[PDB]
Amino acid sequence: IGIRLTLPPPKVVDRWNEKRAMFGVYDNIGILGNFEKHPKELIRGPIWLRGWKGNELQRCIRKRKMVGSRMFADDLHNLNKRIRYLYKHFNRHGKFR
Amino acid sequence: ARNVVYPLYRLGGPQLRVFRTNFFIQLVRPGVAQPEDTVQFRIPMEMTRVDLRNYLEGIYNVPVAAVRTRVQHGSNKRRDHRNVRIKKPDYKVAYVQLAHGQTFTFPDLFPEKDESPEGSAADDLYSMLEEERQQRQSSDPRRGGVPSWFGL
Amino acid sequence: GADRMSKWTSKRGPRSFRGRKGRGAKGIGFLTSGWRFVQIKEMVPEFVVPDLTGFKLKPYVSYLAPESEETPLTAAQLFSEAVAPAIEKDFKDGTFDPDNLEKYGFEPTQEGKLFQLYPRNFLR
Amino acid sequence: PLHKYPVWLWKRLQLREGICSRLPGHYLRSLEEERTPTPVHYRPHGAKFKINPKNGQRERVEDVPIPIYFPPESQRGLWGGEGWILGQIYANNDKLSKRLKKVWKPQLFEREFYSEILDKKFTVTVTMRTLDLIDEAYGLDFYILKTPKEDLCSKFGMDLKRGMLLRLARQDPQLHPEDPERRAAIYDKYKEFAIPEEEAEWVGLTLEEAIEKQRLLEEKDPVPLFKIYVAELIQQLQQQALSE
Amino acid sequence: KVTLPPHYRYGMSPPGSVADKRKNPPWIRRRPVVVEPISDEDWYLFCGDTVEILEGKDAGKQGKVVQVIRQRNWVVVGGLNTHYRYIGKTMDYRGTMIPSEAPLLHRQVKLVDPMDRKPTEIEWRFTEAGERVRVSTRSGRIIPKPEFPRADGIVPETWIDGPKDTSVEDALERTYVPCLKTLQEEVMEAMGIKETRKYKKVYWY
Amino acid sequence: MPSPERLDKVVDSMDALDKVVQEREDALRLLQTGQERARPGAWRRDIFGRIIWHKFKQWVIPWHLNKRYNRKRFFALPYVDHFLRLEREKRARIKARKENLERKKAKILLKKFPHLAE
Amino acid sequence: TEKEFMQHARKAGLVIPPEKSDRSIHLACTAGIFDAYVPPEGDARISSLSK
RNA sequence: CUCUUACUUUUAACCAGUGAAAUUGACCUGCCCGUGAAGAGGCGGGCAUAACACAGCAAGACGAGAAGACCCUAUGGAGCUUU
RNA sequence: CUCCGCAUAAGCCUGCGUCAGAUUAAAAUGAACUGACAAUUAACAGCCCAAUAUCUACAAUCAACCAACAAGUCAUUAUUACCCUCACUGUCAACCCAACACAGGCAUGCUCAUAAGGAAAGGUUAAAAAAAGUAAAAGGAACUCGGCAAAUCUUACCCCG
RNA sequence: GCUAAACCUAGCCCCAAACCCACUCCACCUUACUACCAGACAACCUUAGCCAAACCAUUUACCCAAAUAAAGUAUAGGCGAUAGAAAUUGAAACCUGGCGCAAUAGAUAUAGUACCGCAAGGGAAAGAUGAAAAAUUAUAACCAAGCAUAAUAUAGCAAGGACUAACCCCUAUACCUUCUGCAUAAUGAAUUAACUAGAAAUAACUUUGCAAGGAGAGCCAAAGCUAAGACCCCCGAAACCAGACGAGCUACCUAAGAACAGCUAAAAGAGCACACCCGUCUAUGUAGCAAAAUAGUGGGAAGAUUUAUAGGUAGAGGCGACAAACCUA
Numbered sequence A: 001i002g003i004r005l006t007l008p009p010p011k012v013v014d015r016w017n018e019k020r021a022m023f024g025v026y027d028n029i030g031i032l033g034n035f036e037k038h039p040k041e042l043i044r045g046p047i048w049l050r051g052w053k054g055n056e057l058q059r060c061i062r063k064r065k066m067v068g069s070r071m072f073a074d075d076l077h078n079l080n081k082r083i084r085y086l087y088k089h090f091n092r093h094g095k096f097r
Numbered sequence B: 001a002r003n004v005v006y007p008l009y010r011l012g013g014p015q016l017r018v019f020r021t022n023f024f025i026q027l028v029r030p031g032v033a034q035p036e037d038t039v040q041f042r043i044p045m046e047m048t049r050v051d052l053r054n055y056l057e058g059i060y061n062v063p064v065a066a067v068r069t070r071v072q073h074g075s076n077k078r079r080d081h082r083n084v085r086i087k088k089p090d091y092k093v094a095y096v097q098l099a100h101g102q103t104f105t106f107p108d109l110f111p112e113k114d115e116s117p118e119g120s121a122a123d124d125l126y127s128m129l130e131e132e133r134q135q136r137q138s139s140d141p142r143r144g145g146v147p148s149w150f151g152l
Numbered sequence C: 001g002a003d004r005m006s007k008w009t010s011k012r013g014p015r016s017f018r019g020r021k022g023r024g025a026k027g028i029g030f031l032t033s034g035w036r037f038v039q040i041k042e043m044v045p046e047f048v049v050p051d052l053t054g055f056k057l058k059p060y061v062s063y064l065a066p067e068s069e070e071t072p073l074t075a076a077q078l079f080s081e082a083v084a085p086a087i088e089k090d091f092k093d094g095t096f097d098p099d100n101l102e103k104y105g106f107e108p109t110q111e112g113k114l115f116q117l118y119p120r121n122f123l124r
Numbered sequence D: 001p002l003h004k005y006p007v008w009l010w011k012r013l014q015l016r017e018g019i020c021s022r023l024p025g026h027y028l029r030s031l032e033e034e035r036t037p038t039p040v041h042y043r044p045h046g047a048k049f050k051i052n053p054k055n056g057q058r059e060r061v062e063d064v065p066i067p068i069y070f071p072p073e074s075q076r077g078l079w080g081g082e083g084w085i086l087g088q089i090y091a092n093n094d095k096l097s098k099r100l101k102k103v104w105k106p107q108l109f110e111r112e113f114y115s116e117i118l119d120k121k122f123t124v125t126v127t128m129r130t131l132d133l134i135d136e137a138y139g140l141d142f143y144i145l146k147t148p149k150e151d152l153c154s155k156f157g158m159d160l161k162r163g164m165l166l167r168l169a170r171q172d173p174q175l176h177p178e179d180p181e182r183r184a185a186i187y188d189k190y191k192e193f194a195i196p197e198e199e200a201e202w203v204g205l206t207l208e209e210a211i212e213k214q215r216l217l218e219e220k221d222p223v224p225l226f227k228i229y230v231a232e233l234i235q236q237l238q239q240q241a242l243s244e
Numbered sequence E: 001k002v003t004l005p006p007h008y009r010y011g012m013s014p015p016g017s018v019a020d021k022r023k024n025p026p027w028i029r030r031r032p033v034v035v036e037p038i039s040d041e042d043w044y045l046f047c048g049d050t051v052e053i054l055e056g057k058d059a060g061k062q063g064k065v066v067q068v069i070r071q072r073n074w075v076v077v078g079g080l081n082t083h084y085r086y087i088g089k090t091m092d093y094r095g096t097m098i099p100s101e102a103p104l105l106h107r108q109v110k111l112v113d114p115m116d117r118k119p120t121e122i123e124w125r126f127t128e129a130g131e132r133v134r135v136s137t138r139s140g141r142i143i144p145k146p147e148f149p150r151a152d153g154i155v156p157e158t159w160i161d162g163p164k165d166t167s168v169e170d171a172l173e174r175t176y177v178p179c180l181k182t183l184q185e186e187v188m189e190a191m192g193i194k195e196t197r198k199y200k201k202v203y204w205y
Numbered sequence F: 001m002p003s004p005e006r007l008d009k010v011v012d013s014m015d016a017l018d019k020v021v022q023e024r025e026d027a028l029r030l031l032q033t034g035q036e037r038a039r040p041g042a043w044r045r046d047i048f049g050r051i052i053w054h055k056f057k058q059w060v061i062p063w064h065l066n067k068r069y070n071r072k073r074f075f076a077l078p079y080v081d082h083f084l085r086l087e088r089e090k091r092a093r094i095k096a097r098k099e100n101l102e103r104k105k106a107k108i109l110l111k112k113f114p115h116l117a118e
Numbered sequence G: 001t002e003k004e005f006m007q008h009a010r011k012a013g014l015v016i017p018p019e020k021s022d023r024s025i026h027l028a029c030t031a032g033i034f035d036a037y038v039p040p041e042g043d044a045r046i047s048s049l050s051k
Numbered sequence H: 001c002u003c004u005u006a007c008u009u010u011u012a013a014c015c016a017g018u019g020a021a022a023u024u025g026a027c028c029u030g031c032c033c034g035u036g037a038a039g040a041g042g043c044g045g046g047c048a049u050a051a052c053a054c055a056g057c058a059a060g061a062c063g064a065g066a067a068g069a070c071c072c073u074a075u076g077g078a079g080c081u082u083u
Numbered sequence I: 001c002u003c004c005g006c007a008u009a010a011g012c013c014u015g016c017g018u019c020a021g022a023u024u025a026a027a028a029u030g031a032a033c034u035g036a037c038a039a040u041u042a043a044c045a046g047c048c049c050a051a052u053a054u055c056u057a058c059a060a061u062c063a064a065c066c067a068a069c070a071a072g073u074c075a076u077u078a079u080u081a082c083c084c085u086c087a088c089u090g091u092c093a094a095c096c097c098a099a100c101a102c103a104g105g106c107a108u109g110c111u112c113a114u115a116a117g118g119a120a121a122g123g124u125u126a127a128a129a130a131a132a133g134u135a136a137a138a139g140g141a142a143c144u145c146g147g148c149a150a151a152u153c154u155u156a157c158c159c160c161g
Numbered sequence J: 001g002c003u004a005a006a007c008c009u010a011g012c013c014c015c016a017a018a019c020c021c022a023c024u025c026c027a028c029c030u031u032a033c034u035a036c037c038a039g040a041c042a043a044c045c046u047u048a049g050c051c052a053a054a055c056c057a058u059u060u061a062c063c064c065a066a067a068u069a070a071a072g073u074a075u076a077g078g079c080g081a082u083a084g085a086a087a088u089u090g091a092a093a094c095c096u097g098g099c100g101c102a103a104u105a106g107a108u109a110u111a112g113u114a115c116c117g118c119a120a121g122g123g124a125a126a127g128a129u130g131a132a133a134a135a136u137u138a139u140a141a142c143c144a145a146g147c148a149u150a151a152u153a154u155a156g157c158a159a160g161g162a163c164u165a166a167c168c169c170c171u172a173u174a175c176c177u178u179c180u181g182c183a184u185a186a187u188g189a190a191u192u193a194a195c196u197a198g199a200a201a202u203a204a205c206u207u208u209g210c211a212a213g214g215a216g217a218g219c220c221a222a223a224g225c226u227a228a229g230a231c232c233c234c235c236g237a238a239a240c241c242a243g244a245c246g247a248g249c250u251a252c253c254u255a256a257g258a259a260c261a262g263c264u265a266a267a268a269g270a271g272c273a274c275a276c277c278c279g280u281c282u283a284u285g286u287a288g289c290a291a292a293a294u295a296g297u298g299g300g301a302a303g304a305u306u307u308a309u310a311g312g313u314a315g316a317g318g319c320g321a322c323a324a325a326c327c328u329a
C-alpha cells in the first residue's frame, strides 16, 4: 500500500531541442551590444515581476498598484486580505525584534 | 393549436379559426372495463374537450355525444445514478362516448397468427447455429468424459 | 420539508390554489354572477378541414425521385416571380406610376384586413 | 485573470459603441469635462506656495474640496452650490475628546423670482447665497446663463438655461406677442449667451434623457422591401435600355 | 435522440445498442482514447474499397472494407485480422465458433491501385468536369468511390410504390403560383368561407 | 413496433411542410411591412440588470392604465452593478479554462503524433 | 450509508448481433455436409481386399 | 414496617435468524507487607500459581461519560446598577 | 383486542394495483425496493358579479313567556347597460410534522360501541437480580425527613395568599 | 486464501494575449415560469468594528490611474504606538508559456447537484482492462492494518543476555507532554494508510569581483563598495461590528370561524364529572418509543376557556398577568 506495483513509463528527454540548445543566448546583449539593451528586458512574464524581486508582501503590494485596477473583484479582495495578514505577521510576529 | 399565441377576441369580432392544427392524439386501450360506446384517448394538456369534439367530427367524421377529461400525474419517484429524480411526463386522458348507438372495441393489432410467419424464414446465421446445435450430442456417461473426436 | 425543486402545479396547494391554476388551455369564455360560465362561440377555434377526396398526394414519397437541391425562398425571389412580370409589362406599355402600386399587389397598411401580417391576428 | 481595460474606464467605453456613440459631439464633450466647481464651504489658499512658519521654507499648497451631499430636494430649487456637510467633529474642539457625527444643513427660503426671457414667475426654494449671486449677476437670467453646470448644482436650474437658450436661438415670438419692440430689446441684452439651436437643445440633459431623445430621432418603421425592389427594377430597366 | 456522455468511447458495436449500453453505462468514466485529427475532406477510405494490410497477423492481404468508424479512425475489412469467438452460447451448449474481425487503423492499411494490385498513396485532385477524385501518387490513375448499399437498405432499382407512397409524377408536379396571399386567405377563397366581421385593434405591450 | 422509421419520416415531413409555409409568410411580411418578427417586442433591462427581449402581449387597455403591467419593473438600480461584474467575471473564468484546456490537448497531441508539426 | 452494490447486469442473446447493421458476420466454413455420405456396409472387409 | 412469602406476565437463560453504542498506549492483566509524585496487577522482600468457557456480584482498576459549573489566575469576555 | 373506525380540511405527491425480478423484510408466499404497464372521468368542491346614487335604530338563546349585559354574524331601492350559456382545475394510496415503517404531535363531522379496524406469544426452559401485577397468618405507621407508595373513602387546627 | 492493494487520465492552477456582452416556438414581478381590463409605490444619505497601542478613551497602513529614484526624507502624531508626501526624475514592453497539481492534490465541482436548513445560507462523496468485449470461462502472482490457513499450558512493559532447547534461569518501573520532581492512580494516544506545522529586515560573518573608489543615473565611501549564501511555525476561545434571513415553534395582538356529554343548581370567572386543555406526586425510562416519553395518580373543564385558518410586531429590537420568560429543540 502506498507504492506502485509497476514501473512508470520511461522519462525520455531531448537534450538538444530548440529551447535547450539555445538557452542562455543573448544574456550578454548589453556587454556585447554596446549596452543598447539590458538583460532584464529579455525576461517575460507578469508585468509586475519583470526585472524585480521581493518577498510575498512586496510582491503583493507591487501587484496591487500596477494591475490592481484590472483585477477581478474576488481576486482583488483576497489580495487586500493577504496584504493585511502579511503586514501583521512581518511587523508584529516573529522570534527576533 | 399549442405553443402559439391566440388572437384576442372582442365583442363583434371574427370567428377564431385554425387551418393547420398541431394537436396530435393517440387512441389507447382502456386499462379497466368501460362501456361499449366509450372510447379512450390521450391528448395534449392544452387541448380541451370542446376541441376534441370538433377535432374528431371534422377530421375523422365521428359523431360524439359526450367528452370527459382528466389529468394523470406522472411519477417523479424514479432516481438516476446521481440520485436525481426522473419525471414521467404528465398526460391528459379523454373519454369519448359515441352518439348514435355506435359501439367501439379496441382491435387486436398484434394477432399471433399474423405474427407467426407462414413463409419459411432462413436466416443464414440462425441456420448455422441450429444445424450445429442439433448435430452435436451430449457426452455419453459410459465414455467417462474421454474425448469422442478420436476414432482410435 | 417542502420540495422547492419540483414543478409547481394545480395539484398542489389548498382548494383555492388548485382551482385558480391551470394547465395551459386557452379560455373560451368568462365567469358571470353565480359562478355561471358563459361560452363564446367566437373564442372556440374552428377547425378548417378540407375535402380529401381525389387527392393524389400521400403521406410518403417514392424513393425513385431526383435529389433536387434546396433553394430557401426569399423576399426578392418572390418579388421577381409574381410582382416583376406585371411591372415590366406596364413599363413597356408606358403606363406606370407609384400611385398604382396598390393595383400591382402592394398593401399600404394592414388595418381593415382579416389576416394581418404584423402584428398577425390568426393561427397557423 | 485580468481585465483588458481598467474598471474606471468602463463608463467611457460605453460612449464609444451603441447609441451613445451616435450622440452629438458637443454634448459628449460636456460630459467628460470635469471642471472644478467654485468653493462654497471652504476657503482657498489663494496661492500655490507658502512659507511654513515652523521651518520657514517655501512649501507647495493644494486646495482639497470638501465632499458635499446634495439631497434630491435640491434639484427642485436653487441652493447656489450649497449642500449638507456630512462629517465629524471633536467635542469642545479638543483632539483628545471623543469624535462625533455632525451634519451642517443650509437655511432654505421660499421666494418668488421673475424671468424676463420666459415671462413667468417661479416659486423656488433658495439659500441666502443664491440671492447674493443673483445680485452680482444683475438678474436671474444672467445668473442662470452665466453660472456653469457644476456651480448651479440643480437640474431645474439647468432646465431653465435650456429654456432660455432655445428662445435666444429660435427667436421665439411667443415672448410678448403684442410688444414686438419690447421683445427685441430683451434679446439684445442677452445676445452674448446666444448658442445655435442645434447645440442649445442638448443643454442640461443627462445621459438617460439624451439616449431617450436620440432613440426617438432614430425611431422609424422599417421601409417595406416592396419599394426597395421596385427602385432596383426601374433603375435596372433604364440602364438596360441604354445598352440597346 | 442521442445521449452520449462527454468522453464516450466509440466501439465496434453501434451506439445505443444493448451491447453498447452494457459496455458503456451512463456512469462509467474511462481515459479518453487519443485519435489523430483528420479533416473529413482528407479522409480517403470508404466502405466497399479494397485495401492492403501493412502490419498485423496477416500482412500483405487485400480485402474489402465493410465498415469504417470515423471517430476512432478505424477500418474494418472482412476476413482479415480476425480472431475466433464462440457465438450463440448457452449454459448447456458451448456454442458455435466464428471468426471475428478486429478494427484496423487508417495507417495500418494502404489503398491499392486498380491497374496494379499493389499498395499506393493517393492525393485528391479535380477532373475536367470539376468533380473531386482521389489519384494515386505513383502511376496516377483515377480511383472512384466504390458503390455501397445504403444503410437503410432500400434498393432504388427494386422499389415498388405502395398504397401510401406518392407517385413520381404527382410528387414532382408543380402547382404553386407565386402570389401575395397567405395560406389562410387563399384557403378561405377555395373552401368558400366568408367572414364580414372586422377585427378590432388591440394594444401590444 | 413494426417499423418505427415510419413515424420519424412523417414527423420530418410535417416539419418540412411547416417550414415552407412559414417561409412564404415571412417573405410576404418583409414586402408589405418590412418586419423580421411576426410578434412585436423590444429590448429591455429586467429588474436583475440583464438584457432580455420582451415579447409583447395582447391587451384591451393601454399600458398606463393596466394595474398588473405597471407593477413590473424594466429598470435596474445601482445595487445591481456589482453583481453584473461578478457574473461577467464568472463567464470570463469559464472561457479562460476552456481556451487553455484546448491548447493543452493540442500540445499533448503532438507527443504521440509528432508528424503533425506541419 | 446509502451506498449499494453496482449490480445491474441483465441477460441478453448472443445468437444475432445488433439489427439494421450494414456489417454482417463473415463465415469461412459451412456448418454441415451438403450431401451425406454413407460408406457401403462391408467396406471394412474390403480393407483386406485391397484390389 | 415487625418480616417476608407464593403465583402470573415482562425481562431473563438456551436454540435459530438479524445485528448497535460509549470504551480501548501496549499487555503474557494474582495476594500480603513495605517502598514511592506521599493510596502499586507492573518497584523491593515474601506467599501463591496447568490450560479454558458459561452464569452471577459490584470492593478495586484513583472505572466510562462531559479540556470542574466550586476556588484562584488572565492588564480574557459579557449582563445589570450607579453620586 | 378494539387504544378505534369511515369521511372532510390541511399536508404529501404515485409511496403494498398488474406483469417481472439477481432487490428486500427475522422470513430464497409477501413486498412499502427496482424495471415496465395501467390509473383519479362532475353533479361534490374550487374558479364569480356592469355603473352611479341611495337604503340598512329594534340581537342570539326551540324566541314564545321571562330576564339580562359583555350590547351582538347575515336585509335595499332608483335609473342606465345587459338574449351565446355548462369551459378550465382538484379527485390515487397503507399518506402529513417528528433524521426511522418512531409508544410522540395533529382541526372538523358521523359512529359512542361498532356492520368498521386490528394481533400482546420466533421456539423452548420456567435460576438470580430487575420491572408490572394479584393474594396474604397475627399486629396495624412500630416504616420514613415525610403515611412516599398502596389500601381506604376520613376529624380538627395553624402559617401564607 | 479473503478483504484489499496498485494505475493516468478527467480536469484544474498561475501568467500572457484579447475588452466584454443573446436568439426556434410558447411561458414567466399574481402563489414567477399563470393567454385577455381603469392605473399613477418608486432610485441616491460619512461604514462600523475586530485589531495595534501589551488596558483604554485621541489615534492604528487598506490599489485609485507611470516602474525606478527623490524617501521612509519633509511633515503629522495620547510628538506614543505608528502614519507619511510632493516638487523633481524617468524605463521597458515578441499571446499561444510553466525547476505548476495529477483523484485526501489541483477549482467546492462527476455539482452548487445529492443532502441539511422555514428562510437567508451551508455543502459533499467518487473513476481506472485491452488494438479489439461483434475477443468477458477476462487483465497471473507477490505488499497495510484486519482475519483465515494455525486457540491455549506456572511468572509478570513481554524484551534482552543467552541456551542443545520455544518456555523454564538471570537482568529490566511503556512513550509523549508537563514539572522542583511522574512506573505513577497527571495529559494524549484502538490501529493502518494518506494529509498535517519556522515565512523576513537591520547589522555582522563567510566566499568572489573591482578598488580610493565601488555600483548597468539615484546610493554609499577617512578600504570601501557590488553580488551571493545563510536567522524568525501550526490548531483553538468566549467575544465585537456591518448587512441580509426569520413570528408555519413560541409571546402578545388583528380579522372572520369552531368546540364544550350527562348530573346538581339553574344565579354563577359555581360544584361533581367525559371529550378536550394542563402537567401535582410516584415508578419506569436515561444513546429511550421520545434531543422531555410511557403507565398510574392528579388540576381545570360556559370561561381571564380551548382550538383550526390567514395576517401583524425583528435583534441598539420585539413581546411579556417580570419567570431576566419566549422570539424555529
Ligand SMILES: [K+]
Residues within 6 Å of the ligand: A089, A090, A091, A092, A093, A094, A096
Ligand atoms: K517580525
Ligand SMILES: [K+]
Residues within 6 Å of the ligand: H005, H006
Ligand atoms: K406464601
Ligand SMILES: [K+]
Residues within 6 Å of the ligand: H058
Ligand atoms: K467494581
Ligand SMILES: [K+]
Residues within 6 Å of the ligand: none
Ligand atoms: K472518572
Ligand SMILES: [K+]
Residues within 6 Å of the ligand: I012, I013, I095
Ligand atoms: K404522498
Ligand SMILES: [K+]
Residues within 6 Å of the ligand: I103, I104, J289, J290, J293
Ligand atoms: K414518543
Ligand SMILES: [K+]
Residues within 6 Å of the ligand: I117
Ligand atoms: K373486522
Ligand SMILES: [K+]
Residues within 6 Å of the ligand: none
Ligand atoms: K484587551
Ligand SMILES: [K+]
Residues within 6 Å of the ligand: J108
Ligand atoms: K472537494
Ligand SMILES: [K+]
Residues within 6 Å of the ligand: H037, J182, J186
Ligand atoms: K502525578
Ligand SMILES: [K+]
Residues within 6 Å of the ligand: J186
Ligand atoms: K486528571
Ligand SMILES: [K+]
Residues within 6 Å of the ligand: none
Ligand atoms: K497515564
Ligand SMILES: [K+]
Residues within 6 Å of the ligand: J176, J177, J187, J188
Ligand atoms: K501528551
Ligand SMILES: [K+]
Residues within 6 Å of the ligand: J247, J311
Ligand atoms: K404571522
Ligand SMILES: [Mg+2]
Residues within 6 Å of the ligand: B069, B070
Ligand atoms: Mg374534472
Ligand SMILES: [Mg+2]
Residues within 6 Å of the ligand: none
Ligand atoms: Mg442469538
